[PDB]
Amino acid sequence: ETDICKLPKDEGTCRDFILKWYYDPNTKSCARFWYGGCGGNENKFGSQKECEKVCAPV
């Protein structure tokens, strides 16, 4: 709980769909997806390494 790592990939139904990295609890690493600035959640990074620094692979 209060564990962002449990929140799913965010393609935030808006108008700026840019590609970002999200953390996958199944692997515990990150993949590349299409996020949007206004109608989303926060499991969205700029590079796998950022992700690795926010949730990480354990």
What residue numbers bound the domain in which 23 lies?
1-58
- Compute the distance between CA of residue 26 and CA of residue 20 in angstroms, rounded to an integer: 18
Q: Are 9 and 40 within 8 A, CB to CB? A: no
Q: Return the residue matching tokens 């990074």.
A: 45
d(CA 16, CA 3): 26
CA 10, 51, 16 angle in degrees (round to 5)?
Answer: 35
Is the Cβ–Cβ distance between 35 and 7 less than 8 Å?
no
Q: Please tell me the total count of domains within the chain.
A: 1
Contacts of 49 (CB under 8 A, 6+ apart): none
Instruction: State the structure-solving technique.
Output: NMR
Report the CATH number at residue 29.
4.10.410.10
What is the DSSP annotation of 11-42? --SSS--EEEEEEETTTTEEEEEEE-SSS--S
